[PDB]
Every structure is written in structure tokens, then in C-alpha cells.
Amino acid sequence: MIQPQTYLEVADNTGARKIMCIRVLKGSNAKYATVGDVIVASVKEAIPRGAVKEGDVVKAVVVRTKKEVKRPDGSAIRFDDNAAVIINNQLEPRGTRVFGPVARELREKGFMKIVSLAPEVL
Amino acid sequence: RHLKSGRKLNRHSSHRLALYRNQAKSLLTHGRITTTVPKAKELRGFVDHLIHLAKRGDLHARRLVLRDLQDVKLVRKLFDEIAPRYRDRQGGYTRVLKLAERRRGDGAPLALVELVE
Amino acid sequence: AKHPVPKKKTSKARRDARRSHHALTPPILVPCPECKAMKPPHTVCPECGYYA
Amino acid sequence: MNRGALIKLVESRYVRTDLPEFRPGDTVRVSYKVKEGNRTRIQDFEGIVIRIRRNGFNTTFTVRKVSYGVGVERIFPLHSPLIQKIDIVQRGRARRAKLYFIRNLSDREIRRKLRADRKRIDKDRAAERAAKEEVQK
Amino acid sequence: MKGILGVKVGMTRIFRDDRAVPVTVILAGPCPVVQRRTPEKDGYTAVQLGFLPQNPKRVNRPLKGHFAKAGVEPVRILREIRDFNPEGDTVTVEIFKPGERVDVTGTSKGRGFAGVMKRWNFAGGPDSHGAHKIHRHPGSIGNRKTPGRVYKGKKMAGHYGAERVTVMNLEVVDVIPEENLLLVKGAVPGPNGGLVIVRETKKA
RNA sequence: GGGGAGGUUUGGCACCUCGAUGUCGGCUCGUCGCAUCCUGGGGCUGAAGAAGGUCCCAAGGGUUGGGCUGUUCGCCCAUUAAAGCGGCACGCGAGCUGGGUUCAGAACGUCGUGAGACAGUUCGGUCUCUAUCCGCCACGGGCGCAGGAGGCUUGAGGGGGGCUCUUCCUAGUACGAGAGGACCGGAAGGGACGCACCUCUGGUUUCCCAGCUGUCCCUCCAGGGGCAUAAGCUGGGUAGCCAUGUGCGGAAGGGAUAACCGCUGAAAGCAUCUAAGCGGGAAGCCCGCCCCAAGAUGAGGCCUCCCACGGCGUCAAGCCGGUAAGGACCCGGGAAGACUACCCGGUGGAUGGGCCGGGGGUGUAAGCGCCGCGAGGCGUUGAGCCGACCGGUCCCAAUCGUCCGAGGUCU
RNA sequence: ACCGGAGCGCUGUCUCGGCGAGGGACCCGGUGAAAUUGAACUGGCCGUGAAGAUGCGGCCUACCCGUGGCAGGACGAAAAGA
RNA sequence: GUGCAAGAGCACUCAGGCGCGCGGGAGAACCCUCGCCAAGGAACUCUGCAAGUUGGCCCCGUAACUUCGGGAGAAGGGGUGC
RNA sequence: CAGUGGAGGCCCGAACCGGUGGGGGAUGCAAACCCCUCGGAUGAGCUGGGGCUAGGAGUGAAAAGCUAACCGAGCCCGGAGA
RNA sequence: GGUGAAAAGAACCCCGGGAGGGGAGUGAAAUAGAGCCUGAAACCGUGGGCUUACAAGCAGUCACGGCCCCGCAAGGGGUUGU
């Protein structure tokens, strides 16, 4: 479950390394954001002269979580860290090649751009 | 509320535990022990396990009962006289009887734990 | 002595009233097989003994 | 009415026996009936079993594996209709029931911490190839 | 207006076609009609359904005559079902086809004298900076000289749960007539053993 | 330039209170007003559409998280359908806090010869276990209910709930130069909230299992106990209770209305929604759903069971005892519970305890054999131990027994 | 152990509470206080009155008596207002 | 007395002494004291108040600044049993 | 420079002295206490016993602090029925 | 501060561990029996009469009625339903 102060790992090559969440984008008052949810977030650290710098407020989409996601088929799935990818207002990834696994949930959300670039769509 | 669970007990743990042990010791030393109704009902089930266990024989079962009762001689007596007497009597190796007396001073209801015979 | 304090002396009437359900209730006893003596149900008894 | 158990168990005809034994601390890959865009496929999942959560029916179990630098864990209902074929791959010394401690030290130390249960290994390969020859003739 | 008594037997999940489904299992044994009340004899329409078998000795009551008045094995319990005059002499799980949605009444679990936080999911107080006296308290409860009293129905701590609770629109899943079983969409009031009634919902 | 409403601001007056009516903020808990921030309805538009403007109707519900400050307020970040304004002693300190201010300490600026002083500033600085009454939440005992008793009920009356968005289909159609982009009707997903539940996910699980240190002891070795908390520490855990987990709810629908739209239609040959009359029309009103509920003393209904008088008061109202149906005590006990109440059982019995089996947890007891100098390893072994769950079995325990309870007024 | 600003670590401070242990609370037996106290047979609303009424007016509601619990009122107690 | 780098520290324990002059149950809310917690990790709040983190020894290693003594246990890291 | 040496209102830490912060306690165990935490810990150190200084007076690393549980002038009689 | 004129201060029996009672006995008197003359009031209690579980109150007053009580009646006492 991601929330306001939560730090996320960056799954893509956008140049950012870690972004703290800023606001979970959803209802007028959504408490948490899980896989496939888009969030506003400040960049808290980034590679030198990347595409996006520190302090840049950006939109991003959760791809991995530490809290396990329940599947309709009774199955479940859990990662080692909370990660996310930076996106456009067009809702498309600012970066290219996005490394590290992702949840199948991203598919039913319209993020096939990501699942395509993603190596392990688990 | 959460009494959806097995039995009840006073004191803390190490205390109440040593309590069950200490009653059992006496109870296997005298066969007939008078005590408060509650203490009795709980002690009832505790001893029955010790008997049915002594009903076995292997030194494992012996050493097992050695954890609660500490006197080697008392447990010796258990595996010799006590257990056989209760041969073939699966379960209910002990009895509890409500006494009509009430301890003066605290007004506690008394009862009796008898090794059945 | 502190915060909560009785605002008025409770009248003797209102006092006694509260002690309405205060009254005791007699013990329950039954004749035994042994003596004609009265034992409380589900019990042994001195000067009477028992069986089994 | 004195059947509260059997009754719940009656509903349990959804059971399955095709599935092999497997105790925590030994890698295992399951083929899972995953649905793609709209079609169906069988995604494989190779990894160590960390937890088996017995509870009669609906007894689940979980599997953890490294996947491109990231650790992943999947929980599977044992009698899940979606589990195509669960294939063992290697068995090892448990010495413990639930073993998450592997989350803290995923490395070559995990290997030297989870030996190889030669006991079950022998019984496996033996009863496998030996029972083959008996079914043949 | 279908209806039928039963007991919550337990709950586990089954697999629909290819997705898992948490379902509760109710047991609505054969319920013998004991008295049909018409607008003539009473003032409404309804049926008295009996339930579990009974030791004829325990029912020495005048109930024996009520049972005889309809000639039925002494049941243990019996409740009415409004606006519902069936057929035959007994209702069964046969009344419910899988897919039909039902309302299940039941008696919630007994929590006794429960705190306000427990009961009304209040907020209580701060665990740190404040006084270690109001950690789980309701805090304020009114105003000043006006109204100078406390609103009837103010949420406060007290006996809670263990009451008539009806959950609704639960879809009936596979129903086994072979054993008088009845599966539902899981959440249903009461403990595993409580008498529950199962009616027809209101979707329209 | 003129008339007024409100009683949230600043203030005037000095009326209760100085043998005390605790002050600002915050928290907790709210509730009410409507002059409506959002959602619903509607008129006009300099309303093409979408978006918006102003005015009318309407509280049902809703009305986010954070940075700065003691702040209220305000500014700002990110979002929203919207982030409404007031009252309730600027609601709430016998509910909490005590950051602000109004005790003593100390300091800066400033004023005073001075001691000191300053709605100027700065650091520090005791917020009082026990509720008698009203009120309130819960739970009982009494009596009543025109005969007594068991079960099942009606529902006057009251309470709960009442929110909302996004995408898609209609259709890229109407409208439009283009960009944009609908009414109406239909589908799917979601936020917060509420009720219930433990399958699942995830907690706890105080002794269920295992490992480990120090030490003291049983019995020298092995094995085991005590203590290191009120578990010594550690790894792990059923049932129960739970949310982070699952289900389901807000309706639909009927009826009457608000603003407003309209039919027929005079008064007043025309004209008018009105004066007689009628139709349409809200997230709102009534009902419908869900909960309580006959102390509804206006004590309701149904079904069934028991039913004369045995002795005093001359009509009349009553009193004493044995009883009936039936009830209570007493006991074993419960996802019932502070107590009491409630429900099940009490030998014609499985209610509890034990025991057996199953589920579950732990994860290969001990002893012996074997390999190694040794610490240890391997085998017998998924062994041993094993709460609470699902059942079974009279081994123990619910023995025996007692008390109460009508005899039914009159027209 | 002075007063301010920041960051890393770690956290039930918080989102947001949950379960558990023990000592009280609660029931039974023994002992048994206190401040306070005009007398009380001490309900709601809207008026009203020395201007914030259980006690006046009008209306509404309400069988008698307890136990556990909450603090809104009794301008609650306390101290002849600093 | 044993153990832990040392010790009058800590844990257990001799000799010696004691279980604190009301008990018996039950296993509500609430209070105290204490244990644990998914995800998040100061969002709490006047303030990280409180709590948690870290902790002993041995080795490696250590900055600005300095009044050359300090800053230093800086910091960061490795080892620890049989 | 190495060795020896063992300085210090030096460091860490019990006893002992003290009272940072928090919680509890508030008709208390207690007219200042308890728990956790925290300062000093060879010194301007702590402490036993014997002595001296007092009411406009004494003491005071200075708070108008202390001078027998309330000190901007102790307590007890007395002027005094101010 | 106070038995009584005098101690004549209650032998003996009964219940009880005792305390205290019950008879007996002294005395004019023993509710003059020993911290004992008289023995008021608040306050606690037992028995009897009237009364009370649809009711709203500074507790009274005025009226009528009912029940009990002194008198033959007329009258008066007590209680309280409206």
C-alpha cells in the first residue's frame, strides 16, 4: 500500500532513482494506492543530468508493492520493494526500457506500453 | 468476550502452573485433597493426563511426567501402585465433590478431589 | 473531597428505597438419604457421610 | 446435525490428488493457467517454497524467487483448478516450518543454509525409476 | 415471497468457473408447515415453519397439541415468514435456484459491554502528548447551559452485538438438495450454529 | 440617496454572577440554522454545443491530505464533485491537551534618578483517584395487563440509512467555420462511509511446538525443572478477537409536493396555469428497506394445554391450605454475560472434564545402533510433543430433592 | 539534562487500529471512610422571571426500585476572587 | 560462589531471612504497567513529547575547525559461540 | 624520537550526592512519593560527631532563598477586648 | 461530678468459650443493676392503622368522598383519592 510520504523505487531509466509519493491520485480522498495506481510524487534523488531532476514533481504509476496483491483466482503476489514508473499526462512512460518485473494488473489498466517494455510481466 | 476459548485460571502463568503441579503432587500423595471448587475442576483434568500417561510405561512417558512432578519416588509410586489400579478405566481417573462447608473469613466454597475407586 | 460530591443529603426515604433489593435470600436445602438432616443440594455433609 | 465437519467437507469435492508432495525449503515450478489479453496460457514459476499453510482444503503455500534483481512471492491455493502441473525440481533440508529468514540473506549463504535432503532425494528418484519398471512389464 | 429457516454451518471458498469465490454454507433442513395464518383467522398471510427434531419428552408442553393440530414430528424451533403461502407440507432448499439473491437474517456475535471505540469505531485519544487518562474515551458529550442536557441516542459504550442483523442480496451459489445444504456469498450474521432465516431479496 | 432583516464583528450600557460563571488555540464528540460549497430540480442569459453567468427551489447526505505559524485566519503544495458560512457560554478543560495569554526566575529593546514599568520581545514555569440528583448509554428486580399457563405474532410509535466520481455503448450523431461536444437511455469500474463475517491475505495467539545464553538444582553422564517479567531471549502458530482481508448496503418502486412548466377556464366577448377543476415536476416530504417496539395502562391477535369449592364473611370485595397446566430454586455449561438476564443440557443424558479419532501447530522426542579424536552427523522418523477447532465414547461429574402456581367479580 | 533549524537511522507519534499479559474495575465473604448536605415528592420544549428555571405559564412526554457505565446540567465541589 | 574484559554492575545462587496482616471468584467497558503487529515510516505534534533505534570488548578506519590538548567512542565498517 | 612516569575543578561507570525529561500519584505509600530516564562521580566532592552566628537580625556561588512542613522580615507570651 | 435509705451490689440453676441474657433473690422502686437519678431532641429499629406502581412536585392549604379510631347520635381524631 502506497501513501503520501512513501518512498518508491524507479523501475525505468527516466533518470530518477527514488521518488517519495506526494498524493495518491484517485477519489476525493483515497487512503492508499496499490499496483496500477497513478500518483503524484516528488523526485527525491536522481542520476546526474537525467531526463528528470530532483525536486521535479511528477506523475507515476505503481508497478510493484511490498504488500501482497490478491488475485480473483484466489492467487496472490508480493514483491521485495515498492516501485513505480514516471508517466506523461498522456499517461505514457517518460523513459524507455523499464527494468524489473511488474504485476499483471497493469494490463487491465491500459498500461500495455509498460508491460511490453517490461521484461518479466509476472 | 474472547472466553470463546478453553478454560480459565488465576494468578499469572509460572505461578498458576506451579500451582497445578503443587496440587497434583499433594493429590498423588494423599489421593483425597480438599480445595476450592474452581481450583479443583482445573486440577481435575491436569492429573488425569498424568495418570493416563503413567498408564503407559516407556521411560519417555516416565521422564515426561518427571517434568511436572519432581519427586522420583512419587512418580515411582505412580507407575507402580497408582496406574495399575486404574487399568482399563479409560478416562475419569479422578472425582470432584462439592462440600457443604464454607471457609470462614473469605466465604470460599470448598470441594473434594478424590482419586476414584 | 474532590470533583464529584453529593449535592444534597439523600432523604431517609430515598435512602431506604435504594436498599430495596438489598434484602437477603434464604439458603436452599433438602433432606438427605442418611439423616433427616438438611443438606444443600449436590453436596456431602458432616454427621451424615455418603456413598460411592 | 452432528456432522458440522463432514458437511463442509462434502462441499469439498473440488479436491485434487494429481499434485505431488513438497515440504518447505525446496525449489519447485508450477504451470499456472494465466489469462493473457483475452486468451489463455501457462506461465511458469520456478522458485523455493517458503510457506505451506495447511488448513484441510484451501490449504495454500507460497513461493519466492529472484526475478531480474527483484524478489517475488506468489501464494497458491493447493487445490486450485488453475494450477496446471506442479513440478518438483530439487528438495532440501527444512529444519524449520516457515522460513522467511531467507528474505534477509538471499545469496550464496542461502544455498549453504538449505542443504539437499538426500533422504527424500533417494526416495524420490528411487521410487520413481523403480516404479516405472514395475508398471512397464 | 420464498422463505426457509436454517443454521449457519460454516464457510469456505469454492471455484466458480475459473475464479475463487468465498461462500458460506447454510443448512435449511426440511421445514414442516405448522400453521398457515390467513387475513381471516389473523390479519396477515404467513407460515409457521418448524425445524430440528425433538425429544417428545422435552415437549410435554401444550405445544404437543399445537404439533398434533397439524400432525407433525415435534420440532425444536418455529418462526413465521410474512406473505408466503406455499404448497404441500414442507419447504426445502428446492425453493432456491442458484443465482437467485436472498436476504439472510441472523443474530450477530455477542460482544457484551463494548467500549465506544469498539462499538461506534470512535477515535478515542492521543497515545503520546496527552493525559494517560483518556486514551480510549469519548471525550466531550454536550455543550453548556444550552441545551444543558444530552441528546437521546448519543453514541456511548454499552452492550452491543448479539442482536437481529439482516444482510442482503447475497447471491445463492450451488445448492445441494442431496443434503439440504445451501451455499451463499459468504458474509452472514451469527456464529456457526445459529438459527438463520433465508428470504427473497429486494432488487426490484 | 432612501427602507430594512440578522445578532457571526468592533463597540455602548453596567442588568445576574467578585463567600469564583477557568481564559485563546488544538483534540474528542457532535448537533442545529440556511443566508447552499458540492450533488438533485428549475427561470433568464449578451444560452449554438461543451463550459460558464445571475436568480429561484431544496439540507438528504457529503464537504481531502500536507508545508508555515501557538494561532483562529491566511498564504502555499497536491488533489476534489465540492473542499460552504454560522449557532450551540466565539458548544465541549468535574472529557484531554496547555503551544498563546495573566504569578514568582532570567534577558533584549524602550521608558523612569530610582524601586520598577511596557495588547513590545525572548527562554522557564504544580491543569485537583471516588458522580448524590437531572440528562444519557446499557442491563435487571417489582407490580400491572378483569382466570392461570406454553409457543408464535401484529405494529401505533420511534430509530438507522440517505454521498459521489470516472471510463465505455448510444455517437464522434444533434449543434458547430474549426476546435470542440451534448440532451435522453443503457453498461462497467472506483473513493470515502455504514453493517456483518474469518474462506482467503494479514495480525495477535502468556506456555501449542521448537532453538538458545547464564546459573541453581534433581542424579555423575545423558534427560529435565526453576529464574532471568508481571513470557529470560529467539523462530513459528490453531481456535477466538480482528483489518490491512471477504460479502452486502445507499436503491428500484408507489404516493403527495417545492420552484417551475402546462391543459381546460371565467371574473373582464379577447387574454390568463386559477378564481371551480385537472396533468407534469426534486438528492428533499410520506411510504417502501433495515433495527427497536403492546408500560401502545388505549397493556392488542392467533394456536394450543390446565379448569369448579375443601373451611370462615348472610348479598358484595376478600382470607387460609393441597393441587392442575406450567414455572423457580439447585447442578453441568455456552461465540450468552460485569452482576442479573438470555439459550442448551441434567442419567429416558453427550452439557462439561478425561479418553479415542480427525483437523492443526511444531518440524524428525527420548533410548538404542552406526560414522567421526571431538563439536556433531546419519538411521530407526514427518518422529515426538501436541490449547481452544469437527466429531465419537457414560470413565468422572450434572445425585437425591424442594418450593411456588388458578379453582376464574358484575351488567 | 540550555533554546532554535535540518537530515540519515528507527519506530504504534500517526494513517488506524488490533489482539495479548498482569494489578485494579465487576460478583461473593470480613472490615469500612470522605468532601458535600436549606428541605425535596428533583423530566423535555417554548415562553418567562434579577436578563441562562426540576420548582412560575403553556404545551409534550413519563408505570415503582435498583446495578454497570458517560460527563452535558445542577450557574457542580473546593478557596468570604489573586 | 559461578559467569560475563574488570567491578561493590548484571543474572542465578550459599549461609541467613522473607512471600510485604483481607481473602474467594469472574475473565465487561475503562485505567495503570507490559508484550507484538501487514503496508507506510514523522504524514502525529507547539516540539519525534514518548517510545523504538544504537549498545560490551577486540581490530580496521575517521572530516571541518583548533587555543594543537582537542574535535574522537567522530563518522562508517568487520569480528565475537562450540 | 623511543622508553619509563602517572598529572587533571580530565573521560566511562556503581556506591554516595543530585534532580533533566516523561508517566503514575493528587481524601496519596507520601503535607513532595514511586517507575523509566537523566546530571556529578579526586573535588569549588560527599559525610558522622563536637561547636559558633537570629528577627530589621543571621546566613546566602544572590532565588528576597534559608533561619523547625506557608518568611518582602521567624515563633511564644504580653500591650490587647489594637 | 450524681445506684440506694443501706451494698443489702444479685448466692444457686439454665444458654453461652466469653460478653451478655433468662429464672431465682435484695430493695419502696432494678426501664434505681453499676460511668447505674431524672433521661428531652436529632438519629436507628419492631408491631399496628390509613395510604401508594398512568404519575409532575417549596410538599402545604381549601373541599368532597372512602377506610380505621374514641361517642348512642350530633360530633371529634388519624390517613389520603380526586
Ligand SMILES: [Mg+2]
Ligand atoms: Mg533508504
Ligand SMILES: [Mg+2]
Ligand atoms: Mg502534478
Ligand SMILES: [Mg+2]
Ligand atoms: Mg537539490
Ligand SMILES: [Mg+2]
Ligand atoms: Mg517545485
Ligand SMILES: [Mg+2]
Ligand atoms: Mg520498505
Ligand SMILES: [Mg+2]
Ligand atoms: Mg516482454
Ligand SMILES: [Mg+2]
Ligand atoms: Mg526480453
Ligand SMILES: [Mg+2]
Ligand atoms: Mg509474462
Ligand SMILES: [Mg+2]
Ligand atoms: Mg468458541
Ligand SMILES: [Mg+2]
Ligand atoms: Mg513456575
Ligand SMILES: [Mg+2]
Ligand atoms: Mg517467570
Ligand SMILES: [Mg+2]
Ligand atoms: Mg488435555
Ligand SMILES: [Mg+2]
Ligand atoms: Mg505434558
Ligand SMILES: [Mg+2]
Ligand atoms: Mg423506613
Ligand SMILES: [Mg+2]
Ligand atoms: Mg427499612
Ligand SMILES: [Mg+2]
Ligand atoms: Mg453428592
